[PDB]
Amino acid sequence: SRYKASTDYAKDAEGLTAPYVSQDPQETAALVRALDDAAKKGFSVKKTRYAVASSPTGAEVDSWRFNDWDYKKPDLPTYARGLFTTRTQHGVPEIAVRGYDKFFNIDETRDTAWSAIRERTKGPYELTLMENGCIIFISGLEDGTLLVCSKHSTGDLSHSSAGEKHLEAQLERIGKTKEELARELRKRNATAVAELCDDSFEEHILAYGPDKAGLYLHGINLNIPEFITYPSPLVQKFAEDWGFRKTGLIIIDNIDDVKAFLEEVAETGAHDGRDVEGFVIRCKKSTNPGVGPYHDWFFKYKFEEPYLMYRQWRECTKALISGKQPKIKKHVKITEEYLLYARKRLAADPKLAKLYNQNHGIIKLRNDFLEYKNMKGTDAANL
Numbered sequence: 001s002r003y004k005a006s007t008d009y010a011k012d013a014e015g016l017t018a019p020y021v022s023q024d025p026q027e028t029a030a031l032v033r034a035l036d037d038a039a040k041k042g043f044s045v046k047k048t049r050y051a052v053a054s055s056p057t058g059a060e061v062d063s064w065r066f067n068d069w070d071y072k073k074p075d076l077p078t079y080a081r082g083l084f085t086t087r088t089q090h091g092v093p094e095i096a097v098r099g100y101d102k103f104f105n106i107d108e109t110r111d112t113a114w115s116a117i118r119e120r121t122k123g124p125y126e127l128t129l130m131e132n133g134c135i136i137f138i139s140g141l142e143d144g145t146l147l148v149c150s151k152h153s154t155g156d157l158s159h160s161s162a163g164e165k166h167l168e169a170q171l172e173r174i175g176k177t178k179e180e181l182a183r184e185l186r187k188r189n190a191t192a193v194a195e196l197c198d199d200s201f202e203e204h205i206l207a208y209g210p211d212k213a214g215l216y217l218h219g220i221n222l223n224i225p226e227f228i229t230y231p232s233p234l235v236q237k238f239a240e241d242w243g244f245r246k247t248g249l250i251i252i253d254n255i256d257d258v259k260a261f262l263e264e265v266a267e268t269g270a271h272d273g274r275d276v277e278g279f280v281i282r283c284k285k286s287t288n289p290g291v292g293p294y295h296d297w298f299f300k301y302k303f304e305e306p307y308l309m310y311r312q313w314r315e316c317t318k319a320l321i322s323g324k325q326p327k328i329k330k331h332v333k334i335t336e337e338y339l340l341y342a343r344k345r346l347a348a349d350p351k352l353a354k355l356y357n358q359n360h361g362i363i364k365l366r367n368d369f370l371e372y373k374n375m376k377g378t379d380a381a382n383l
């Protein structure tokens with residue numbers, strides 16, 4: 001529309017002030033108590049302990065994974081998606097890593113029905129581009145160690161190490177170190193939340209060539225049981241200061257404009273000339289509208305097409321490579337032709353199957369077929 005994803009916000013961020021809330025050891029220990037009771041099953045959580053290989057005090061961290069069901073229940077001790085717990089060298093219990101609260105796509109839950117959002121949220125609405133990769137958490141442990149995790153893990157080429165290597169490069173580029181980053185993040189009591197996007201490491205659906213590749217900072221959260229997240233202009237500033245790639249942002253005051261905007265982009269699945277997987281919308285939510293305490297609250301707007309078709313193509317090719325039956329659920333006749341074109345490309349280049357299995361060549365194979373068909377991915381999806 002007349003709206004533009006932008007990355008020049010970081011300079012209005014000087015008027016704003018980062019939120020800060022310290023950790024209450026008592027609060028944290030009760031949260032861990034309740035988490036361990038849920039791990040002692042017989043809501044349900046699963047706990048995994050990891051060493052922190054570069055921690056000079058041998059810190060360990062405990063990752064808590066809920067299944068997506070439990071987040072729709074009331075009365076959970078926390079709603080973090082991605083949560084890591086620890087004891088410092090002095091025995092203090094702490095949240096080492098806190099992700100976003102599990103958030104949901106439009107119409108996926110009662111709260112993410114458009115009518116529910118109109119009623120129970122207030123603006124302004126932060127429209128943050130949804131980069132297509134894997135989530136990466138970064139924080140600073142008490143002994144100065146820079147902790148890098150994937151959504152539920154941190155050992156070793158794991159996603160978390162690939163994320164860390166990328167962080168090492170960006171910090172080298174700006175002449176800063178991990179230890180300075182760890183001190184800054186602990187100073188803020190915060191987890192940095194980034195999307196790792198690199199076709200050379202792993203392909204997803206949209207492309208990320210050698211430029212464009214790296215860690216896209218889209219969030220900073222307070223390491224506390226409750227959900228408090230930085231406003232996105234403050235995130236973009238932190239990205240600049242610490243060498244992250246920034247996540248594009250639109251701010252729309254009115255919620256009816258948000259719906260119309262998101263629907264317009266959804267016709268193409270593209271915005272400002274670039275393909276876009278979706279938006280994550282950030283605002284304040286009330287238990288019941290009118291007044292009430294407002295807390296931070298996200299919802300997803302994941303554009304259905306042509307990305308569903310691309311995803312079906314990905315899974316159908318893997319099923320072709322493996323011996324399993326390709327699941328054709330949508331875009332029937334064009335997927336018929338895609339699967340025949342793929343079979344021929346595999347016959348003429350037998351090593352593709354191994355590569356495709358390891359998530360290299362997904363995007364190229366799709367784009368080659370669309371070339372052969374002389375179509376844009378959008379029109380192929382619209383058949």
Ligand SMILES: Nc1ncnc2c1ncn2[C@@H]1O[C@H](COP(=O)(O)OP(=O)(O)OP(=O)(O)O)[C@@H](O)[C@H]1O
Pocket residue numbers: 068081102103128129130131132133134135136194195218247280300302
């Ligand atoms: N601007 C953004 N704001 C929030 N999340 C983003 C953003 N851009 C990309 N993401 C990624 O989107 C994910 C949520 O959308 P997606 O549909 O990929 O969910 P998912 O991978 O099934 O994970 P979950 O089960 O945690 O929802 C986050 O885990 C995060 O890695």
Ligand SMILES: [Mn+2]
Pocket residue numbers: 068
């Ligand atoms: Mn999920």
Ligand SMILES: [Mn+2]
Pocket residue numbers: 131132133
């Ligand atoms: Mn994703």
